Design a protein around this ligand. Structure first.
Ligand code: CLA
Ligand code: CLA
Ligand code: CLA
Ligand code: CLA
Ligand code: CLA
Ligand code: CLA
Ligand code: CLA
Ligand SMILES: CCCCCCCCCCCCCCCC(=O)OC[C@H](COP(=O)(O)OC[C@@H](O)CO)OC(=O)CCCCCCCCCCCCCCC
Ligand SMILES: CC1=C(/C=C/C(C)=C/C=C/C(C)=C/C=C/C=C(C)/C=C/C=C(C)/C=C/C2=C(C)CCCC2(C)C)C(C)(C)CCC1
Ligand SMILES: CC1=C(/C=C/C(C)=C/C=C/C(C)=C/C=C/C=C(C)/C=C/C=C(C)/C=C/C2=C(C)CCCC2(C)C)C(C)(C)CCC1
Ligand SMILES: CC1=C(C/C=C(\C)CCC[C@H](C)CCC[C@H](C)CCCC(C)C)C(=O)c2ccccc2C1=O
Ligand code: SF4
Ligand code: SF4
Lengths: 739, 160, 148, 80, 130, 61, 74
């Protein structure tokens, strides 16, 4: 009878496994039409409509989190197992600059063995662009046995998380008060999870990754490198590489932290041997992060007369312009899972995009900057994940507004005041979007039409009307001057992208000053415009989710509904879901432009080879500066030019990329059937098909119905995203692996 | 011969294709070492390529000017193994599938909960019906004769 | 290749005919709307009721079949133009070999013959084909505004 | 303004009237059904065409039918 | 603070009526509440009722009726909606005969009633050029 | 026709036209559509029952 | 060739659209029916389900197999 958990709440039985749709009150009666099948999967994780108790929803969410973490652990275990058994990691360790990472071999069936490429190191397989080899090298993993043991540990951890989910749904489910301890949860997630994870990783780096990687960079082969445990039992194997361990932990406890400058450095730049960040800098960074997060975890009052109450902090932040201020926000975020999901997903996607930027900007792994496929894939993948997560955060904000928003509890607070002037916000955001689009894109079109008319001096180019990004160049200058002036204890700039020397590893450029000209001005304003339009769609969905001048009772129709009818001139897509659908489209557009800008700019003005005398030759040859300012330039010098490797991949080991290119084109075009058409035509065609089936006595008892309007839109957008992202995926991968 | 094509056994371009593929595979084989699994895999590829080309040559297959086997599907039994025999095989298999599906639909359509037995299959009855589809050509021309294959006017029609 | 593309043309013709004939016959009513004749040839819908009635009018059948007509005419004209480009250039073996698979079309017709068009104006100069490149981009833009 | 017609298949279940967002339909006495009531459309000038009325109709092919016609600031749902 | 004492304690929203409800028509909903309950405006956000007479103005009949439907959740039933033309031309709209349209009242005549089902509608070809 | 009888729907604008249903109750009052028929197949609106006139239903033998 | 083929497609779609318009607004079942029996045009609305079902079957057949052969070659 614990005060935090309920014991044996749900019986572990297979009876409900044999009753599909048991969770829903409407679906439990059984299918009558094929719409029931689709409704079954669309409501599976909508725990809000399955129970009327916040406690049950919270417990379901907790167990679902455990299942998701078990799935993630299984995926990581699979990655490590493939590295251990079906990879050339050992060969890549001895030749990182000449062996391509491969960790998946393809069975010899139907002639598909051509996919096993010549990745080097007496190996055949698919080249890997996830950068696991570089990460494992940075971890100090020098043998495939360690990868096997990490895979075994991942399997054990996945089983543990599965057992935890089962235990906390069926044997000991926490109570609502336990879930609502946001102060305790924040304290623990900030100190324990974040800070202690940073501290543990700093310890691992210092004791395992720092010596092993230093020996690897010194040229010591992985076979004669001591086993990682020997660096702990023997204080002399690590005190030779870093002659500060001879003093032990006495400098730490005597506040003489200057003695540890051997392995806790602040250098900046990149390791000249590997092209990645100095691992001493990384260990010092993780140590500082650990201390900062542990300190930050002692902020909120949990069980003693010590710390802050988030309710008292929010309620004190009022103002003349904001009425009641943040009063009621604590009740909103402690009684609505959707609001928490909105905030967490938005910040999580933004964090993913920031991670993507800082990855290539400052390569943190050895021999990852010179693996161009890995860098391109990591950036594009993380930016895509960030965009998807941001759209999801907007969607769940809209869901909270529709479902969990209480008008009485939010009288004259920030949420109320935002809804009260939603018109002004949306109208000014509309004006900003029109201004930004007009300018950015019409400058592009003006360049295109001036070039087409033979007026080269009328373009918005560097040798013409020039739009120099002076503000960004000022920041670039400030960073390259930071070491010794504003960061006096730095030896080198944080990233060579801001300026400095060309860093090359094995005649391949790792990082180099990224010059910003009029071409970068236009593409940056294109980014701003696309982001603003996506924000416009999502914010219009969130703010007008409850009511509008069209439908004053839109909240009574729910978050997900197709329309209110053909009246009022037509009320299609007025939902808030139909705004997360359009916003998904515009996020695809924005992220596609972002990754295109990254790919072309890097290939044209960063990546390449360096001659022995110091001459820099890039992959494309600097065509970004003069040919990325017109749409015809993007079509020809980027799309047409770099699509050569994809279309000429047939018969080679990259033929799978051409096949996926074609299939993604097919899927993207397939999406337009659902996006352009309507439900009535398909229902009436199914009518004649059903007539034929009845004529042959083969009409199913479950009456076949065309997909609902909302499901038609969902299928269309899912296929559109899959096709477009897969086309860009195949194009990028084939292009950056070939060259 | 038929349509201006020639047998692949006497098509020079066919042998040129075989030689070029084998040469590419051997050049790939040259860059690996000893009896290592990559060399074994490439050698197996070479052997399979040679076997496939030899089988296509000795298969009554007509090759065009590009040295690729062309299919003669006008209906003549001479090239009957290209389309006609696979056509019969597919017709048998697909008729089996359709017959067992229709029989299952009509069988569980006379129970208390026909819709339940469509998402949750009666595996015993399903297995009973599925292995009975080998007589689908005979069953179809024994149910059509009895009038049990086609509905007449209980089928629904739209307004016009 | 001619065989396969003729079957593609037949598929396009049959699907366009299916859409148009279905719209014509179902114009006076169906099960979802047994009084469609009372609403005229062109009306938006019958509402979200009865499961949803988007694009239920006969005009919507024309609207959907226009896409299929454009696709079928595109297939026909692609086939004709590629066949005649290979015939005029002399490399009829290029069509006879690469026309049997989709990537052959994408690489040897579109990607191959689009090179002169896109270089109608470059950062170095322009040709009398510059107007055609501008019209190319204009058509892409109007296509995507239609997508809007 | 749109046109709304009521047909004698009406069973007087009132679901159309309580679904109208603009107070167009009302229940009036009748002798053609068990409930003794039939829907009426005396305020079609306020009809917006949202067709919520016939989404709540349980009869087989509807007893209330909305025929969209000429548009008005009331029928277009214009707050401006 | 506010023009009239019977107005709900609303802080004003940029979602209210526009120049249309000054030269074409405006709609006013009146009701009496026992408690100063906090309710959501059909236009903007949260407003506070008056413990007594309450009067609200809107640009559409649908907005007033949505507010009235919300009022039913507060056990408020006596709400009445009027239409005001550009001058003070008041016309009672929603409780037209004092009884809600969902309840049958004597004195109502059927409007728009056809004495046949849908299938009895005339063929459009016979309704050409009239 | 009576309760439990099987009838064929003759109404053309019906989701169950030409189909067979089960009569739930035939009203003896002066209503226009007294016959209430229940069907196994739900219509597009989800309902599985409807009131029919005496001349719109034909009893199955 | 391109101009005339595009014009041809437009004209065919217009022919079918105007056939649909004739069905909606000009077709009279009474004129095309004599004592219950229906004439050659009115009978097209009786087996309309058969026509649409077989058009759908032909379209699915051709699409499935043309795409299958093309993707097999790919
Ligand atoms: C969750 C991530 C993940 C993913 C995507 C894969 C994917 C793959 N694994 Mg794999 N694997 C994983 C986790 C994963 N594995 C884990 C956690 C382990 C440890 C138990 C393994 C152990 C493993 C072995 C030992 C082998 C594979 C093989 C394969 C490949 C063929 C799979 C196949 O045909 O099975 C078909 C499965 C079924 C039909 C069952 C239904 C495929 C690329 C095989 C391979 O690459 O062959 C060369 C192979 O031999 N995996
Ligand atoms: C063998 C062990 C076992 C058994 C018999 C049960 C039995 C039950 N669970 Mg349970 N559960 C288990 C393990 C088990 N659970 C574990 C390990 C977890 C943690 C993840 C949970 C979490 C959990 C929750 C949160 C809920 C249940 C519920 C239920 C009840 C209904 C389940 C149902 O119909 O959905 C059966 C569903 C499936 C078989 C789907 C499996 C989904 C997997 C995880 C997806 C993996 C796919 C993978 C990612 C690849 C995707 C491509 C039933 C009593 C529900 C309940 O009682 O509320 C009414 C409920 O809400 N369970
Ligand atoms: C220092 C203590 C501590 C630590 C380390 C964590 C760590 C975590 N919590 Mg958690 N939590 C804590 C205290 C702590 N919590 C307290 C005190 C409360 C009550 C307010 C909660 C309430 C809570 C909820 C409601 C949820 C979490 C979730 C999570 C996970 C977030 C997912 C993630 O970042 O993946 C990082 C993943 C890893 C690093 C994998 C290794 C982590 C393992 C499992 C150690 C977990 C520590 C655990 C608390 C020890 C208990 C053991 C048990 C025998 C008592 C993460 C594993 C979320 C989640 O995913 O649910 C499962 C979630 O929904 N926590
Ligand atoms: C932490 C992440 C997270 C979580 C927990 C949720 C959770 C939820 N979301 Mg949500 N969402 C997210 C991210 C997330 N979402 C993101 C990133 C987006 C933007 C795209 C959305 C957009 C979104 C919408 C628009 C809606 C939800 C809804 C929901 C709720 C019901 C979900 C359900 O039943 O789906 C069950 C799961 C499925 C139906 C799976 C569908 C399969 C997907 C679409 C395809 C995946 C393809 C995959 C990549 C493989 C393709 C490869 C190919 C080759 C085969 C639930 C509370 C719905 C709701 O009603 O909320 C109350 C709703 O309407 N969400
Ligand atoms: C190439 C196709 C295309 C184009 C041009 C646009 C353009 C636009 N969309 Mg988008 N959209 C598209 C496809 C496209 N969309 C697709 C496929 C979808 C489906 C998901 C959407 C969905 C969508 C939504 C949901 C939203 C937009 C919005 C916008 C507008 C953003 C404001 C802006 O930049 O206006 C400026 C106009 C342009 C940049 C277009 C070109 C104008 C030129 C360059 C300058 C002026 C030329 C001059 C006037 C010509 C005069 C001569 C002439 C008279 C002969 C803009 C009109 C948002 C909106 O309403 O606006 C705020 C919005 O909310 N779109
Ligand atoms: C000689 C042939 C012919 C004739 C006499 C008619 C006559 C008629 N048709 Mg018809 N039609 C035709 C061919 C023909 N059509 C073809 C070929 C098609 C297939 C595309 C159609 C499709 C069609 C439909 C779908 C409909 C009609 C309708 C009508 C009737 C009203 C027309 C109307 O309102 O126009 C209105 C005229 C316009 C809206 C102008 C549209 C102009 C288009 C958009 C092109 C202009 C853009 C231009 C190319 C700019 C270039 C851009 C630049 C940048 C390059 C009328 C009886 C309508 C009706 O109600 O019938 C009873 C109806 O719904 N027709
Ligand atoms: C590449 C895009 C694409 C594809 C593949 C299809 C495919 C199809 N459409 Mg279609 N359509 C599209 C775009 C597309 N459409 C667009 C953009 C529109 C405009 C809105 C339409 C409008 C439209 C209408 C109005 C109609 C169709 C119909 C059809 C079907 C024709 C029969 C057929 O070929 O069966 C073979 C099917 C395929 C080759 C594709 C699916 C096969 C996959 C690969 C199987 C994979 C299994 C794993 C077929 C499913 C007709 C229909 O339903 O006929 C029955 C019909 O009436 N479509
Ligand atoms: C940026 C302007 C800014 O944030 O100043 C801050 C300004 C000050 O508001 P308050 O003093 O009332 O805020 C006090 C508390 O609400 C703390 O949030 O906020 C606004 O007035 C919002 C108007 C946005 C207008 C957009 C331009
Ligand atoms: C990779 C991976 C994995 C593994 C992992 C691991 C292996 C981990 C480890 C971890 C660890 C191994 C951790 C540790 C930690 C520790 C700690 C965190 C400690 C701390 C301590 C402290 C904090 C103390 C303090 C103090 C006191 C209290 C008193 C005296 C003074 C002083 C200050 C010292 C797995 C398989 C799962 C899955 C896959 C991935
Ligand atoms: C082979 C040969 C021959 C023959 C040929 C032929 C016989 C052809 C035919 C052809 C044909 C035979 C064609 C046809 C076509 C058709 C079409 C193209 C149609 C269309 C239709 C439509 C469009 C319809 C419309 C409508 C509707 C929808 C309904 C209402 C009415 C109307 C009519 C309006 C000869 C001996 C001479 C010589 C050479 C060889
Ligand atoms: C075709 C179509 C239908 C009909 C589509 C249906 C009935 C879907 C049928 C799906 C089948 C029955 C199952 C899926 C079969 C696939 C082969 C499985 C997916 C492939 C896997 C690899 C995932 C609609 O209902 C619709 C509704 C609204 C707008 C547009 C449309 C629309 O375009
Ligand atoms: S069906 Fe399509 S069009 Fe008709 S109302 Fe619903 S959404 Fe608007
Ligand atoms: S449309 Fe249907 S619902 Fe909207 S008002 Fe007119 S009748 Fe009432």
């Amino acid at each position: 009878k614990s005060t935090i958990v309920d014991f044996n709440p749900v019986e572990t039985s297979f009876e409900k496994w044999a009753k599909p749709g048991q969770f829903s009150r409407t679906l439990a009666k059984g299918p009558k039409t094929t719409t029931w099948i689709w409704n079954l999967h669309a409501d599976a994780h909508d725990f809000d409509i399955q129970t009327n108790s916040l406690q049950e929803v919270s417990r379901k969410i907790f167990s679902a989190h455990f299942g998701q973490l078990a799935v993630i652990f299984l995926w990581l275990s699979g990655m490590h197992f493939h590295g251990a058994y079906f990879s050339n990691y050992s060969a890549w360790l001895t030749n990182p600059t000449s062996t391509k990472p491969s960790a998946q071999i393809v069975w010899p069936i139907v002639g598909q063995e051509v996919l096993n490429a010549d990745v080097g190191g007496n190996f055949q397989g698919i080249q890997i662009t996830s950068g696991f080899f570089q990460l494992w090298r940075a971890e100090g993993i020098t043998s495939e046995v360690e990868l096997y043991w990490t895979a075994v540990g991942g399997l054990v951890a996945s089983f543990l998380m599965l057992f935890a989910g089962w235990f906390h749904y069926h044997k000991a489910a926490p109570k609502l008060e336990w879930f609502q301890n946001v102060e305790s949860m924040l304290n623990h997630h900030l100190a324990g999870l974040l800070g202690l994870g940073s501290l543990s990783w700093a310890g691992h780096q210092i004791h395992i990754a720092l010596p092993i990687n230093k020996l690897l960079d010194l040229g010591v082969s992985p076979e004669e490198i001591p086993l990682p445990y020997e660096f702990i039992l023997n204080r002399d194997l690590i005190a030779q590489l870093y002659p500060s361990f001879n003093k032990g932990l006495t400098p730490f406890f005597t506040l003489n932290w200057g003695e540890y400058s051997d392995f806790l450095t602040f250098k900046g730049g990149l390791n000249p041997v590997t092209g990645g960040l100095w691992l001493t800098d990384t260990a010092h960074h993780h140590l500082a992060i650990a201390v900062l997060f542990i300190v930050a975890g002692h902020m909120y009052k949990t069980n003693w007369f010590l710390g802050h109450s988030i309710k008292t902090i929010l309620e004190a932040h009022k103002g003349p312009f904001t009425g009641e201020g943040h009063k009621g926000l604590y009740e909103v975020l402690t009684t609505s899972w959707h609001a928490q999901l909105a905030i967490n997903l938005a910040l999580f996607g933004s964090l993913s995009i920031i991670v993507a930027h800082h990855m290539y900007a400052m390569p943190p792994y050895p021999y990852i900057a010179i693996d161009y496929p890995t860098q391109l894939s990591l950036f594009t993948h993380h930016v895509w994940i960030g965009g998807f997560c941001i759209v999801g955060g907007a969607a769940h904000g809209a869901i909270f507004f529709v479902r969990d928003y209480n008008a009485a509890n939010n009288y004259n607070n920030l949420i109320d005041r935002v809804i009260r002037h939603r018109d002004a916000i949306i109208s000014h955001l509309n004006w900003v979007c029109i201004f930004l689009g007009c300018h950015s894109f019409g400058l592009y079109v003006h360049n295109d039409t001036m070039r087409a008319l033979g007026r080269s001096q009328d373009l918005f180019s560097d040798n013409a009307i020039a739009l120099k990004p002076i503000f960004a160049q000022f920041i670039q200058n400030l960073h390259t001057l930071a070491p010794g002036s504003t960061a006096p204890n730095a030896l080198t700039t944080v990233s060579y992208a801001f300026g400095g020397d060309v860093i090359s590893v094995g005649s391949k450029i790792a990082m180099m000053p990224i010059s910003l000209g009029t071409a970068d001005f236009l593409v940056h304003h294109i980014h701003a415009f696309t982001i603003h339009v996506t924000v416009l769609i999502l914010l219009k969905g969130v703010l007008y989710s409850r009511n509008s001048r069209l439908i004053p009772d839109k909240a009574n129709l729910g978050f997900r509904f197709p329309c209110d009818g053909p009246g009022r001139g037509g009320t299609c897509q007025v939902s808030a879901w139909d705004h997360v659908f359009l916003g998904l489209f515009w996020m695809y557009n924005s992220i596609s432009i972002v990754i295109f800008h990254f790919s072309w700019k890097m290939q044209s003005d960063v990546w390449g080879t360096v001659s022995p005398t110091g001459a820099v030759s890039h992959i494309t040859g600097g065509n970004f500066a003069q040919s990325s300012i017109t749409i015809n330039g993007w079509l020809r010098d980027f799309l047409w030019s770099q699509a050569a490797q994809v279309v000429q991949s047939y018969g080679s080991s990259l033929s799978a990329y051409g096949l996926i290119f074609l299939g993604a084109h097919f899927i993207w075009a397939f999406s337009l059937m659902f996006l352009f058409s309507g439900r009535g035509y398909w229902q009436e065609l199914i009518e004649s098909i059903v007539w034929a089936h009845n004529k042959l006595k083969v009409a199913p008892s479950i009456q076949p119905r065309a997909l609902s309007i909302t499901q038609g839109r969902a299928v269309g957008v899912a296929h559109y995203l899959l096709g477009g992202i897969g086309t860009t995926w195949a194009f990028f991968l084939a292009r950056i692996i070939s060259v | 011969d038929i349509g201006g094509l020639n047998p692949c056994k006497d098509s020079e371009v066919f042998q040129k294709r075989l030689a070029k593929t084998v040469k590419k595979l051997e050049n790939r084989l040259k860059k690996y070492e000893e009896g290592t699994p990559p060399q074994i895999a490439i050698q197996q590829q070479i052997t399979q390529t040679k076997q496939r080309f030899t089988r296509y040559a000795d298969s009554n297959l007509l090759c065009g000017n590009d040295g690729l086997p062309h299919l003669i599907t006008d209906g003549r039994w001479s090239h009957g193994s290209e389309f006609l025999l696979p056509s019969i095989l597919f017709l048998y298999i697909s008729g089996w599938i359709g017959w067992v599906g229709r029989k299952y639909i009509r069988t569980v359509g006379q129970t208390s909960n026909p819709t339940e037995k469509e998402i949750i299959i009666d595996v015993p009855l399903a297995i009973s019906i599925m292995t009975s589809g080998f007589l689908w050509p005979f069953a179809a021309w024994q149910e059509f004769l009895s009038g049990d294959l086609i509905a007449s006017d209980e089928t629904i029609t739209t307004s016009p | 290749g001619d065989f396969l593309v003729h079957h593609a043309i037949a598929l396009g013709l049959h699907t366009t005919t299916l859409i148009l004939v279905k719209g014509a016959l179902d114009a006076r009513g169906s099960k979802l709307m047994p009084d469609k004749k009372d609403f005229g040839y062109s009306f938006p819908c019958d509402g979200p009721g009865r499961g949803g009635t988007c694009d239920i009018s006969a005009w919507d059948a024309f609207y959907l079949a226009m896409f299929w007509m454009l696709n079928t005419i595109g297939w026909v004209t692609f086939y004709w133009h590629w066949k005649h480009l290979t015939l005029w250039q002399g490399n009829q073996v290029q069509f006879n070999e690469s026309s049997n698979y989709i990537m052959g079309w994408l690489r040897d017709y579109l990607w191959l013959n689009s090179s002169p068009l896109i270089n109608g104006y470059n950062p170095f100069g322009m040709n009398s084909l510059s107007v055609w490149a501008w019209m190319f981009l204009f058509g892409h833009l109007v296509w995507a505004t239609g997508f809007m | 303004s749109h046109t709304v017609k009521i047909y004698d298949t009406c069973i007087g279940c009132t679901q159309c009237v309580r679904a109208c967002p603009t107070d167009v339909l009302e229940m009036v006495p009748w002798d053609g059904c068990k409930a003794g009531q039939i829907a009426s459309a005396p305020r079609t000038e306020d009809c917006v065409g949202c067709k919520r009325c016939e989404t709540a109709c349980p009869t087989d092919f509807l007893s209330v039918r909305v025929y969209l016609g000429g548009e008005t600031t009331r029928s277009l749902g214009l707050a401006y | 603070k506010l023009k009239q004492s019977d107005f709900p304690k609303f802080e004003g929203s940029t979602g209210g009526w526009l120049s249309a409800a000054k030269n074409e028509e405006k709609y006013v909903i009146i009701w009496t509440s026992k408690d100063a309950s906090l309710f959501e405006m059909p236009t903007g956000g949260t407003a506070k009722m008056n413990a007594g007479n309450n009067v609200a103005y809107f640009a559409r009949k649908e907005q007033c009726l949505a507010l009235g439907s919300q009022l039913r959740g507060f056990k408020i039933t006596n709400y009445k909606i009027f239409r005001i033309y550009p001058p003070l031309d008041i016309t009672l709209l929603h409780p037209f005969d004092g009884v809600f349209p969902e309840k049958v009242n004597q004195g109502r005549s059927p409007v728009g009633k056809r004495d046949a089902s849908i299938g009895g509608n005339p063929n459009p070809a016979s309704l050409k050029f009239q | 026709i009576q309760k439990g009888s099987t009838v064929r729907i003759l109404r053309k604008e019906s989701y169950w036209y030409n189909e067979s249903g089960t009569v739930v109750v035939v009203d003896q009052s002066k209503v226009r559509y007294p016959v209430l028929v229940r069907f196994t197949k739900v219509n597009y609106a989800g309902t599985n029952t409807n009131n029919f006139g005496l001349n719109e239903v034909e009893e199955v033998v | 060739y391109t101009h005339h083929q595009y014009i041809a497609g437009f004209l065919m779609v217009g022919a079918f659209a105007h056939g649909a318009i004739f069905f909606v607004r000009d077709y009279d079942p009474a004129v095309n029916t004599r004592n219950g029996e229906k004439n050659v045009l009115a009978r097209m609305l009786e087996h309309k389900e058969a026509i649409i079902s077989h058009l759908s079957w032909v379209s699915l057949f051709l699409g499935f197999h043309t795409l299958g052969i093309y993707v097999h070659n790919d």
